[PDB]
Design a protein around this ligand. Structure first.
Ligand SMILES: CNC(=O)c1cc(F)cc(Cn2ccc3cc(-c4cn[nH]c4C(F)(F)F)ccc3c2=O)c1
Length: 378
């Protein structure tokens, strides 16, 4: 009864119900019911399980206002809780699609981080639940938009980039000191809160480090404009990198904010992938840049090989780069100072910073087994 009480422990009630409910799910097919045992079970339990499924958090308890972001295996809806009228962002992952086209385990870390970091820098998850087709992650909704939309609507001044970069650095470092590497740092994944401050999201790509502070992966992950050369090189086996691969992407982000184009752009993927590997020969600023001395400096210090990449030793040697000199904040209080863009929000459901958007088995498969334990209620 002890381990049962722990919502992190593998055998809490949320888990025990998921299994029982996953069992009925994966067994109630006319083919399989031709086994006596399976029918005996589904007889004794199908009525109760259907009643139970109704009492558990389900997709229907959420008014859906707009789809505000799509993705590889699902979408993110702006939803309002019908019974409590509270407003959340709800990510949906498709069990169908994760099973076929994925490692289909990325979601545990993504949930665990958003449910337990309790950091100013990490989007907070309140509920994880599921049904026969989908995983659901219910999180605080960030009404400021992402840094993509913002760069889309402003001539970003270095004062601002000095602000946003610092917040991303503190956030990546927060994520880091929790043992995790965020392998997919893009302006798409940096979100702005009610007051215009940064929060990281989409931890689909997170990997916990070992005690030596490295990860050993053997598949290239991320998105191509931002892939670091070691992760890109790691696709060929013997991938050994540390958290410095995030600072590479922080580099790409500063470049894109100030220049307006990604530093290793190419018409094709193979072009970008090649341009990344050849970064000593391919990184150049446009002659008509109007980029600062220290700005171009910091960016070049990020976009180099991992052996010599700035931030290798720690976060403290990024903070002290002259690019960060400013009459507007210090490093230990930047989330307490005013943000360069504060969203004019009229309502709790303001969606303005957002643009608009199985087989039946013969025998037993157990397609719902990977998802036992995902349900969680804070
Ligand atoms: C392997 N990755 C996938 O399959 C995948 C599936 C998806 F649906 C979406 C994505 C990428 N993406 C896009 C927007 C997004 C927005 C929020 C969020 C959280 N709180 N508030 C919001 C906001 F209001 F900004 F929407 C949280 C996560 C994501 C996010 O992950 C990836």
């Amino acid at each position: 009864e002890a381990l049962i009480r722990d919502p992190r422990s593998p055998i809490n009630v949320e888990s025990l119900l998921d299994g029982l409910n996953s069992l009925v799910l994966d067994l109630d097919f006319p083919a399989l019911r031709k086994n006596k045992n399976i029918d005996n079970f589904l007889n004794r339990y199908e009525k109760i399980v259907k009643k139970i499924r109704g009492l558990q958090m389900k997709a229907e308890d959420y008014d859906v206002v707009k789809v505000i972001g799509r993705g590889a295996f699902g979408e993110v809806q702006l939803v309002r809780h019908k019974a409590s009228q509270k407003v959340y962002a709800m990510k949906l992952l498709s069990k169908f699609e994760m099973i076929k086209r994925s490692d289909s385990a990325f979601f545990w870390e993504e949930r665990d981080i958003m449910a337990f970091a309790n950091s100013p820098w990490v989007v907070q998850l309140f509920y994880a639940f599921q049904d026969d087709r989908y995983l659901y992650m219910v999180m605080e909704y960030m009404p400021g938009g992402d840094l993509v939309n913002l760069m889309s609507n402003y001539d970003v001044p270095e004062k601002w980039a000095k602000f946003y970069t610092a917040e991303v650095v503190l956030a990546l470092d927060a994520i880091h000191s929790m043992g995790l590497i965020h392998r997919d740092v893009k302006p798409d994944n940096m979100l702005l809160d009610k007051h215009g401050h940064l929060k990281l999201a989409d931890f689909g790509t997170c990997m916990k480090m070992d005690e030596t502070g490295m990860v050993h992966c053997d598949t290239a992950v991320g998105t191509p404009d931002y892939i670091s050369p070691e992760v890109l090189k790691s696709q060929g086996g013997d991938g050994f990198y540390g958290r410095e691969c995030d600072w590479w992407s922080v580099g790409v982000f500063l470049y894109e904010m100030l220049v307006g184009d990604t530093p290793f752009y190419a018409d094709s993927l193979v072009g970008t992938y090649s341009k990344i590997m050849d970064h000593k020969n391919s990184l150049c600023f446009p002659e008509d840049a109007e980029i600062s001395k220290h700005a171009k400096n910091l960016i070049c210090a990020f976009l180099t090989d991992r052996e010599v990449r700035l931030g290798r030793n720690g976060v403290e040697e990024i903070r002290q780069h002259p690019f960060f000199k400013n009459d507007q904040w210090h490093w230990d209080n930047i989330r307490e100072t005013a943000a360069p863009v504060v969203p004019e929000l009229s309502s709790d459901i303001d969606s303005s910073n957002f643009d608009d958007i199985f087989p039946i088995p013969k025998a037993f498969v157990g397609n719902q087994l990977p998802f036992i334990g995902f349900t969680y209620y804070r």
